[PDB]
Amino acid sequence: ATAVVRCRTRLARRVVAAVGPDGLLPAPCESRVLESALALALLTEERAEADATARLTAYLRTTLRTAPPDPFQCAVARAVLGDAGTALDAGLDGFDHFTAGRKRLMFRTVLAALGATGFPAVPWEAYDTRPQQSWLHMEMKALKVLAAHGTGHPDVVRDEDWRALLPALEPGPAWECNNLAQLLALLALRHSPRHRPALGDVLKHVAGRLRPDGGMPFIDGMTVFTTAAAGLALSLLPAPPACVTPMADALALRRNPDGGYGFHSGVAQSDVEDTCYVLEFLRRAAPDRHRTAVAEAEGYLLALRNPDGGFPTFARGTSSEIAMTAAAASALAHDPDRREEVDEAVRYVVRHQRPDGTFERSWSRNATNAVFRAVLALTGVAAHGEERRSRARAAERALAHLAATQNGDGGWGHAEAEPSDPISTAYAVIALARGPRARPGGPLDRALAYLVERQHPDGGYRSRPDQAGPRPLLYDVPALADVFVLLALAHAT
Ligand SMILES: CC(C)=CCC/C(C)=C/CC/C(C)=C/COP(=O)(O)OP(=O)(O)O
Ligand SMILES: [Mg+2]
Ligand SMILES: [Mg+2]
């Protein structure tokens, strides 16, 4: 076989071996500076868990010394270990996203709660948010409470604000597997005498979440997302392995009542990205075995569709997103009954392509993620006549963007001038596999050679992470590197 096929084979063996007998690919999240700093602040204020606070302190100092994060997270750590405005302007430097205004308020209020800057001089309504992802309501309310107390106006807080924080007082792992939301909520709730009876027991569980490096992860893991993407990659191999069936079973039995999927076990909030990967995987590996789950997932997506033809991440009425719209278009194209919705989705994608051929950054911090989603929809959804031409021209500009920005080593980074990483390159390979056939020395050929060269002796890949949340803050689920490279190699061979 070719070097590429040999690389694909070794990687597939590794991914298959990582899937457990429960059908799941474990996908823990690494410690993160932001949540470690908030856990340290919370435990310090409550004079609790001295051993955990010492490990968190050591984790923060080591990480700042050796692998400092973005400037906002560095400022948060320095505030707890101990200008903020310049760190926020830099951490939000050119953050081109519809959530920018909320993020400025959120991040500044976090820094102010930790004593590093003044609280935003905004009307309290600035913290109001429309229902979206379940935990985001809690984060905003926690920050409102912290601001009201921090400015000396605790009477401002209303019973409806406290009520939003009650899930943070439940025992066990964080509600919706989100440690950031629980920590912010607990930092607020410790100001409330009538909630303090429940604080002691939750602090014990929080302290118990420390990872071996002494830090706190953003989330418990991403095993649904990771298992679905890995199952899809395996189902695109010439001869998919037997384990795709228990993987499909493990995902289907975790579907939410609305028919969608969250990112990890126990996440009740469904989202379009998780659901599209599950749907794409089930369509290939178990379309009859899990016919009802497939239909429920399709119904989930259709119920979220926005009037402009695009799809949001979590809730109808929130802004459509390009990558979510392209993912849903592709996931729904398998049913000839949804031709109209699919075509309106692909037209949305074409309308929002930028003058340079790119699309958007959102849940990924590289440009190649949305390019790969868009190109799959533009080239996979059936189309003829003028609409074929329109879609072909759009896909050409996206693939041209990739060729124009390819690094000398054959890979791509998070932005045009960043060093290459395997995940950003994997997304680009998925897209390029829908262009002309590979030729010696061409962009796809060179990208595949980059991936061949980056394979570790143990068969896997190590990569800078690309996932963000809250956007644009990166978090690291290392299992995704193998999975997305395999997805790329399965598409390209
Ligand atoms: C990769 C993927 C599954 C994409 C869809 C979004 C999603 C469910 C992400 C998984 C990780 C996570 C808990 C993000 C929360 O972002 P946030 O709610 O803090 O973000 P925001 O404040 O920027 O809206
Ligand atoms: Mg958030
Ligand atoms: Mg969050």
UniProtKB/Swiss-Prot annotation:
It is an enzyme of class 5 (isomerase). (2E,6E)-farnesyl diphosphate binds at R102, K103, Q133, W135, R471. InterPro entries: SQ_cyclase_C, Terpenoid_cyclase/PrenylTrfase. Its EC number is 5.4.99.-. Changing W135A: Reduced activity to 64%. Requires a divalent metal cation for activity. The highest activity is observed in the presence of Mg(2+), but the enzyme can also use Ni(2+) and Co(2+) in vitro, while is inactive with Mn(2+) and Zn(2+). Binds a binuclear Mg(2+) cluster coordinated with Glu-139 and the diphosphate moiety of FPP. The keyword Isomerase applies. It comes from the Bacteria. The active site is at E273. Its cofactor is Mg(2+); Ni(2+); Co(2+). Changing E139 to A/D: Loss of catalytic activity. Keywords: Isomerase, Magnesium, Metal-binding, Repeat. Changing R373A: Decreased activity by 2-fold. Mg(2+) 1 binds at E139. One of its GO terms (molecular function) is metal ion binding. It catalyses: (2E,6E)-farnesyl diphosphate = (5S,9S,10S)-drim-7-en-11-yl diphosphate. Mg(2+) 2 binds at E139. Transmembrane segments: none annotated. It holds the Pfam family SQHop_cyclase_C. PFTB repeats lie at residues 244-286, 294-336, 342-385, 395-436, 444-487. Catalyzes the cyclization of farnesyl diphosphate (FPP) to drimenyl diphosphate. Cannot use geranylgeranyl diphosphate (GGPP) as substrate. Belongs to the terpene cyclase/mutase family. This is Drimenyl diphosphate synthase. It comes from Streptomyces showdoensis.
